[PDB]
Subunit: 143 residues, 2 copies
DNA sequence: TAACAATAGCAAA
DNA sequence: TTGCTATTGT
């Protein structure tokens, strides 16, 4: 019960933010921003409406349109009319977009590996065990 | 390995769950979690909107909204930079520093609760190890 | 005929 | 940025 406890939590918070910043930069190698990547992730398992996209990531509708426009011009997704109500527009991922998405996943996995490089396989297991308990408690609380 | 990826995935889950609960609890002080983070950043000196948006990885507009709320509640104020009077720096007020302090109490209580299954030693061990993860991310971010 | 979606072109001030 | 407004499709 020391100030070390709040330090663990704010360090975890700092890691999330820094990782997000670094992943965003590395995604630039595929000409994608982190959001562009998230739109591809969301459409990877099926077409989605613009509203679903905006709500899904708590982002403005406009930000979603810009991302889609960029992805469309890059041939990563296409706007298509909803077959059940052709007045609606769905964002559908293309084969290229799907392959670009998978490369984004590889970039993430590589970064995630790199970042824990100073830890041995045993330290990794130990850490995972400890923070998994932290996860369990916060989820029980914030249910 | 997958365990290494699992660490980052678990950290992500913890952050999202913690952010959600902190937003709920900080509401007691009429603060959002982001408002709190803005206060936290300006507690040690004035900061620019761009700076705030980058550090917490959020849109610059979100910072604006947060800032407006904080300013109206008289927790922060926008003042011209002595270096360049055309660049606005977000400065915190004594009231904001006192409000921030109350936010730390809430944060500390949740932190103690959430790490409750960990002994003092385990805490030191976890903290040392994840501190290395963060330091590693920063070296690579240069 | 009316109503519901989306979009491009005009406003706001 | 938001918020109409006229127009094309369902």
């Amino acid at each position: 019960s020391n100030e070390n406890r709040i330090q663990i939590m704010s360090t975890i918070a700092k890691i999330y933010r820094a990782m997000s910043r670094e992943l965003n930069r590395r995604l630039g190698e595929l000409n994608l921003s982190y959001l562009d990547f998230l739109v591809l992730r969301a459409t990877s398992d099926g077409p989605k409406t613009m509203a679903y996209l905006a709500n899904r990531y708590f982002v403005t509708q406009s930000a979603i349109t810009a991302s889609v426009d960029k992805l469309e011009e890059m041939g990563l997704v296409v706007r298509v009319r909803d077959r059940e109500d052709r007045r609606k527009i769905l964002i559908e991922i293309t084969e290229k977009g799907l392959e670009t998405f998978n490369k984004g996943i590889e970039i993430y996995k590589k970064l995630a590996n790199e970042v824990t490089g100073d830890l041995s396989e045993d330290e990794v297991i130990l850490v995972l065990d400890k923070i998994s308990k932290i996860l369990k408690r916060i989820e029980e609380i914030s249910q």
